[PDB]
Amino acid sequence: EIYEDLMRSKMTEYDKRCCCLREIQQTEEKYTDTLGSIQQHFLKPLQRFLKPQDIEIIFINIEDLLRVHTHFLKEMKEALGTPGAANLYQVFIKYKERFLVYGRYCSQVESASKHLDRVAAAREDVQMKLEECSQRANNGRFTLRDLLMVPMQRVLKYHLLLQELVKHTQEAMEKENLRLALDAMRDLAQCVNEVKRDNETLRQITNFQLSIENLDQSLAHYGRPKIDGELKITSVERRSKMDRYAFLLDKALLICKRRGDSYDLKDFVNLHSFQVRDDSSGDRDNKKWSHMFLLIEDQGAQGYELFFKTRELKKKWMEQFEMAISNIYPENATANGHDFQMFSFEETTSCKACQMLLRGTFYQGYRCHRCRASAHKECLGRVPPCGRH
């Protein structure tokens, strides 16, 4: 609604297509003005009244968004002015990676918002200056907390705006060219969403890190958490059921024992050399704690028996071990000479198969350690052969 209220102020295909071009322009004008409104009526006045570290946390990247969107609006207006806006698609494609600053924004939205509200709850002089700023900017129609939710909503709408314009473009050449911009804007929307998703994962990893004792390494090295919980376990050597707490991540299983407030790490299992084998024995009597599957070292060096309280739990853990092993060893990991392994990309990277961006901030995809080709899990079989021209 906030974005809809902000953007509030029988037909032929050409007439419908021209209405889409008008909406794209007018919404960008109103959007670029809103960034100017947040800067001139909230940022610059509060610079003289809050700490520069406070300024970086609440206003984040906004100053940079306004600069990117001022230039974007100009190059779009120039593209719209030319005959039949034939080169509009080029403006969207050019600004795609320039818009990746929305990654840095959307990640810290709750972080910047939460910070602002306590600041307002604590300082009495801040609370009414913000109420005065809302009046001078829009006559009390939109508050700052609501105004900071507008940039996330905007970057997520470009692909929807371009979807409609594509739907009404008659000329097949211009339609194909607009489809490329639609793909560039759908890719950007996915990156932004994957960034939000990854910070929650990293926040969850940080929490596990604190709760686990005698763990000498960062959990983040073992990928994404899959499932955690209590279970009973036996090994080739210890055939008596031991009550344990486990954390399953893509590359590891941490077998802990509750040592009061904390979980004490007892057994670290690298899933790179382990296989899961189902056991139907528990199905028959369906007695609590009888539901098992085996977790065996691929050369038979070790073999665990994992007991869950219910059949649903067993089924759920099994499915998560399969998903974890599939992530270590995806389909076609060794296709056409490669050796694709889970990789965390530090810089902006595109897939060697589809040319679309690797999404997120953490274990976004795969890297072949031999040729250094980067790729998404789905695109592995389609990457050109290892070490070629």
Which positions lie near Zn ion, rule CB under 5 A? Answer: 338, 351, 353-354, 368, 370-371, 373, 376, 379, 386
What does residue 340 show for φ and ψ, rounded to 5 degrees? -75, 125
In the complex, the smallest distance separating the C-beta of residue 367 from Zn ion, rounded to whole angstroms, is 9
- Closest to Zn ion by CB, 169 vs 374, is 374
CB 341 within 8 A of CB 375: no
Provide the residue count of the chain: 389
The Cα–Cα gap between 118 and 43 comes to 17
In the complex, the smallest distance separating the C-beta of residue 251 from Zn ion, rounded to whole angstroms, is 21
The Cα–Cα gap between 347 and 370 comes to 19
User: Taking CB positions, which residue lies at the least distance from Zn ion?
Assistant: 351
Buried/exposed code over 216-253 (b: 16+ C-beta within 10 A; e: otherwise): eeebbebbbbbbbeebbbbeeeeeeeeebbbbbbbbbb
HSE, side-chain direction, 13 A CA sphere, residue 117: 10
In the complex, the smallest distance separating the C-beta of residue 365 from Zn ion, rounded to whole angstroms, is 8
In the complex, the smallest distance separating the C-beta of residue 79 from Zn ion, rounded to whole angstroms, is 28
- Closest to Zn ion by CB, 41 vs 338, is 338
In the complex, the smallest distance separating the C-beta of residue 358 from Zn ion, rounded to whole angstroms, is 8
Q: Where are the beta strands (DSSP E) in the chain?
A: 212-213, 225-234, 242-249, 252-259, 262-270, 274-278, 291-297, 303-308, 340-343, 365-368, 374-375
CB 328 within 8 A of CB 271: yes
In the complex, the smallest distance separating the C-beta of residue 332 from Zn ion, rounded to whole angstroms, is 12
In the complex, the smallest distance separating the C-beta of residue 356 from Zn ion, rounded to whole angstroms, is 5
Taking alpha carbons only, the member of 261, 245, 250 closest to residue 219 is 250
The Cα–Cα gap between 304 and 29 comes to 62
